[PDB]
Amino acid sequence: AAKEVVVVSGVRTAIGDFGGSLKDFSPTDLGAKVVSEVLSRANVSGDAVGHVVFGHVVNTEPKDMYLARVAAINGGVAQHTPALTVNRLCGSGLQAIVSAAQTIMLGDADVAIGGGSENMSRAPYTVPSARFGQRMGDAKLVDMMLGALHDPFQTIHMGVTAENVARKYGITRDAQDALALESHRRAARAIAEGRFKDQILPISIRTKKGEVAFDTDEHVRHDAGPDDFTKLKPVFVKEDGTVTAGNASGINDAAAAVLMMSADAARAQGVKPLARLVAYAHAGVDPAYMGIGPVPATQKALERAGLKITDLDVIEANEAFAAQACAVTQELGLDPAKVNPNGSGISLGHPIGATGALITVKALYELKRIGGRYALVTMCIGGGQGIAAIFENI
Amino acid sequence: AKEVVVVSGVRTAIGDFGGSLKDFSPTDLGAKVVSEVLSRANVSGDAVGHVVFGHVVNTEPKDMYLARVAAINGGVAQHTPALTVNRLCGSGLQAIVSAAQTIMLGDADVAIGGGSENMSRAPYTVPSARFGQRMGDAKLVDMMLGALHDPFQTIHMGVTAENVARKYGITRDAQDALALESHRRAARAIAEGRFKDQILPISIRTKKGEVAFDTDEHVRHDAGPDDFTKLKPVFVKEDGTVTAGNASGINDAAAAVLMMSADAARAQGVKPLARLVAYAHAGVDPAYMGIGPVPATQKALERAGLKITDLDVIEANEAFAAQACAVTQELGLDPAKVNPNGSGISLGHPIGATGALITVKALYELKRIGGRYALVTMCIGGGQGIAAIFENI
Amino acid sequence: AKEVVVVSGVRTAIGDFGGSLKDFSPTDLGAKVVSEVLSRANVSGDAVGHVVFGHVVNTEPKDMYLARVAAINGGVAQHTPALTVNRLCGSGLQAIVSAAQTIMLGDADVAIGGGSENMSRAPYTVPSARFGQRMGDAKLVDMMLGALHDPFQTIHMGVTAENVARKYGITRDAQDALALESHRRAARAIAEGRFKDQILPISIRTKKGEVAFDTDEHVRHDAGPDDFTKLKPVFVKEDGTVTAGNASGINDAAAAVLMMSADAARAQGVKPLARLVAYAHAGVDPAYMGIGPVPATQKALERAGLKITDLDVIEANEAFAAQACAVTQELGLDPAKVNPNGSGISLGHPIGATGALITVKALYELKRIGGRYALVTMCIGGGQGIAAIFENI
Amino acid sequence: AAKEVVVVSGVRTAIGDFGGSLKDFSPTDLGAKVVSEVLSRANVSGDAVGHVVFGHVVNTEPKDMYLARVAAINGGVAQHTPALTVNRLCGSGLQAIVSAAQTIMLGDADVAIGGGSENMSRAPYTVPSARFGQRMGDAKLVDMMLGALHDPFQTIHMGVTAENVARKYGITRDAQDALALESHRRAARAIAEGRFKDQILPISIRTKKGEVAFDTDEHVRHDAGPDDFTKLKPVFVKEDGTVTAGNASGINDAAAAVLMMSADAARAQGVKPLARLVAYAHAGVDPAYMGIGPVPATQKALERAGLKITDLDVIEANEAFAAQACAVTQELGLDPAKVNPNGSGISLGHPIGATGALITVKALYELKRIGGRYALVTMCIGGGQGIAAIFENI
């Protein structure tokens, strides 16, 4: 049978705004930082890692095509360890964990690191005409960030797909604004109570005034009220819009990782782990309704775990758009009080490829905060997919 | 872990840098090979549990969706998950392994694994363009050349080939000898038609009319040893051995295989190419990445319960003659069974697709000669190797 | 106002877009023509009072220094002031006028006037690159095409040529007739050697060895009317008449003349080409810029006390057959005396240099036929014309 | 003989910082604004202009290759008026005035506008490899602003040539800092007393808070003291430097213009003019010592006017670098109290192609402020030139 997967350690950076506090840190720099820190939290030597897998979507420089391997080596993992970079768009961070968990389940590794890293502030422009020349007439610099945020089949912003989902599932503007506000208030409470302190790795940021520690998610508005979201205008369609800058996730910079071991290695070393992996599942949907991807993915994951919605103490379902996040909670019958209890993409940000690893970290630490048992991690995926994993606190 | 059978496979002909496939984006070539493998396996696009594609150099925004776009435009139903993987030069074989893992773990009964790369379309980036340069000249960065540079010492992959030539005693004469033979085996394979059945022709729009591109165009059909000894090194100024002639090209191509669980293949009455026996991965010193195949192959043979002499076909990519000679030498392989129809030096190296493409070759060679076991392995920039073993059936 | 004599002049052969002079920067070509005119006039580079050069499209930072770089690297002493002027297609003749003005006003006894342009090397700009684009695709702007667009209506200069064809009754047949004849006159001039003495050969580095570039390469030597009537318009989709064949090319070239006060020329025993009789400028509707030469020429003939029938040589640049036919028609000129050896359609239009270059032609034609008065005029994008009249001596 | 040239009107914009308040106004936009305003100040119809000449160095867009003609037409000058753009680097603004004055002197025009316009914030990057392609390996985006500030013969920054001049002419660091400080204090006094109000055309600048008037030279430090310049480090050479960011001119955005007429047209219309043109002169020098160009140019201009240094009531000599400006004043024997009495490039900025027209405006208004008679306008020129003009208040 398949080997049990234990998540022994996890960490994330705080999440930086677009053009904000992490804009000078490359995706391989952020990835190496979380690799070194998960190894130290698990008390695992860099020479004892079987596989490294990292999620990552937008290459900012040539090194990023080597991302998992540079993150591993500069993170202190020995050169004999294989390293893989995976891209399942917004779900890459969680995919990387599943992919790393699969090496353990199949007996190819006893230890594996799964992470993600993304720096959207550093997303590049391309010039397709530069290699062979344009010859005459104007050409373009192609924004690879906005490009990654366009559905490749209809060439519409992810935001338009969020409007498709609000329309189809009856998610009003007032519902989306209520979810957005509540996410900022939960995140601001979590910061004030220190709920994130143990799971965040501070980053010292070179400033002209001397070094200061970046250890707080800066996208969060701490003074928010209803009118900050009411006054805003829809941004992605000209007619009958509901999706705004305020009730859509940010675009952001972050990295996160977890370190996992077979259950037998974990036993024999005597680790005090975060959780075990119970099940995962994938799904594809209509690309024009990609925001509801978590629904079938979550259903299939719960079937594989032998669990029901009501057994979930903690749910991290990324708020890519309040339009889709509301529809996900509505179609699955979730309790909004248990979904994203400390905020999510709208308030903390959406550092694409890192997001799915980061919110796994969030779910596992929240399980420990409340003494819960089971957590669901799930996210929608551009191009029309969903991914879900269930973890058990142990 | 369930048994994985490879029922069908296909590849495009390999295009030269700036050549016949320069106008075909990577998702276009990926969609073509997807649609064709579905039809060769006679499998509904509604019956696929997972698509995984390897791809290294994003040429446009759509490429960040490559597997998904390849699957949808190739006729796979929207309900199928789709994943893009990057293990540099091994990405193509990785995608096959990753897709086979979904079947081994019972997450899918049917899976497609493939690779697609168009280096001709590799872009230049401008890292200062979003927030501005402000003052001073800025860089336009070659993402193709950057993909071919080791990220630790910022040296060309070719310098790591010189390192491997030093450490393992691969002379310049030894390299050009392999390079020449690779081209003769390829030209010989093209002439006997060995590649016909595995290649999907692509119609390439010319002013002269419609013309079908179905032949690997990197091959020198008139090659003699003199064409190689006259060239001189290009990666180290003095005391060098790797040249443009004994190193692979960089190229444009796509390939894919369709796989099923053993049960599903039986129930569908499909006559399969091969079965997956084992795979393994290895990490090595990045300065010596070209030797990656040796420990990968050793670990895979261990898991498969085989030895080197049980291998009837070996596709060990020729990234550089300097590396491939050393791989053969260290593993004790029979050069007659290693790349019997050429490899990267003669046929090309369309990186993210190569591992899938040479898997296709290896399976079709097994059928040509009636062999049993085939090894597929390659070196990986950054310092890895990947290897897989297949059994004809 | 003192008398201005043109003692010497020279030009390069005109290169095609992407052709023989594509590797010669504008300051390089400018320095060449400076050094040569000094030596043809036998004037020390220490004796020059002013250098003025016309130039429109900056190809690199040095071009913002063009006149100064051309003068210094051409051997003019550093104590000579140097000015770059831009009156678009008239810049070359403007530089001559501006340099002649320093002599007329007694600010200098010796002055060089010239033009230099390399359109092949015209750059692309990135206006968002300094402070960044932030979000959304950005533009790479073609500065060559932008130079050829009217800045008021953002239409190609060719559309203004269609406007001129409408208003003045210039048929498509009339245009191709001028275009064909321009090419035959040029090929005929090249064959008799009319251009030999005025052209400075430039050695152009080829893999085949050293080869001398001394012949205007835009000329079709085998031209018949059929090569023009088969092409069809390119600047308005329907109801058009201007084509690639009856419009000038865009080209790379440099030219210059050296001038002196009458007294200084006498004292130096130099045998001059001609004297400056008069000049004038005109502004017109930008949508009809191609008719600019007509009022300029009329005003210049007034100041010179001459009429159209006193002109033995006319160099009226052929920007578009549609415009040049109308200029000849409105002024009542004899087509036999207008561009007797071709002009922009056959020879090319290296814009900032053209006005200087066709001044050179006009003066050398006066010597060839023993004529007295020559008119030099051209149209100017944005809606101007410039004209100058010279007297052989 | 040559016809007398009367300067009837003049105007300038305030001078914007690099990336500052004028960064969104193109050079043809600024040029049209000053064209329309000089015409209105002279009470001259746009249909009665004989020639327009504008100085301009760095093309920011295709329209700039038509700069004088777009400035003229969009400024309200009739389309029958010829328009010329001139480039004599830093001296282009004054050259444009001389060139326009020459059309009057030679009887080709009775009215002529001479101006300059530059927007360095909008100076572009080029990509020489874009038209025909780079094929392989990295390429460059070429900074055309920094390129314009490099000597084309040795490829050294103008700042290094300023160090050549300080060395050769014995201009110490303390002298350069004293000149720099004094320029900011004079400029700040001029702003507080309103000395610039009549000569500046306000520009309404679209801001999110509503329209605000840009009418004050923003480069000026109003709170400066000696230590702001002492603390700074040399910027252009590694050894034995004296030239700093603080004692070098800024790079800037501005436009200016004057309108001139033959003396007979001015008489017959009855204008109340600023000044008459007395003489101008040019000079070239060693490109490596370009900063002393104003010395021989000023000497030759004074010879042509039949005047002496001591007849000059007002001197506008552009402070490109305190190193060169000090040497110019020292070699000509000028009184520093009469040179740049209200500041210059170091404190107000150096909007290259506009600078020479702008400081003509400054000199003519200062003549009126003090009832002086003769003003010298002079500037150094990259590549090694100088230009000078003398005006008489009438």
Author numbering:
A (entry chain A), D (entry chain A): 6 to 399
B (entry chain B), C (entry chain B): 7 to 399
Quoted from the paper:
In 2020, Tan et al. discovered that BktB from Cupriavidus necator is a polyketoacyl-CoA thiolase and demonstrated its activity to produce polyketides, including TAL, through repetitive non-decarboxylative Claisen condensations with acetyl-CoA as both precursor and extension unit in vitro and in vivo in E. coli. RF2-non_BP3, exhibits approximately 30-fold higher activity in vitro and supports 30-fold higher TAL titers in Escherichia coli compared to the original enzyme.
Deleting this loop region eliminated >95% TAL production. Comparing the apo structure with the structures covalently bound by CoA esters, no obvious structural changes were observed. The tunnel architecture in BktBbr appears optimized to facilitate substrate positioning and product release, which may underlie its superior kcat and in vivo product titer compared to BktBcn.
